[PDB]
Ligand binder design. Structure first.
Ligand SMILES: [Ca+2]
Ligand SMILES: [Ca+2]
Length: 72
């Protein structure tokens, strides 16, 4: 059955509007506002983004998104 990637999927796949497997600051900004009806901030994003990356590329990959959440 599902070991736990379920949540990991629902989140990545959520902010992803192409199921391509990549949530660029763009997708995160198109999915982060709904979390609060309003876009928290701008530098607040790029900041968290820089922290959600493991290669500093500016994009989220399941391998990147997971490695982070998988342990947080
Ligand atoms: Ca995408
Ligand atoms: Ca990255």
């Amino acid at each position: 059955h599902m070991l736990g990637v379920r949540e990991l999927r629902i989140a990545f796949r959520e902010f992803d509007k192409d199921r391509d497997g990549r949530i660029t600051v763009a997708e995160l900004r198109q999915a982060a506002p709904a979390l609060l009806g309003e876009p928290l901030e701008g530098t607040e994003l790029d900041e968290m983004l820089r922290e959600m990356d493991l290669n500093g590329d500016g994009t989220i990959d399941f391998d990147e998104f997971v490695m982070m959440l998988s342990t947080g």
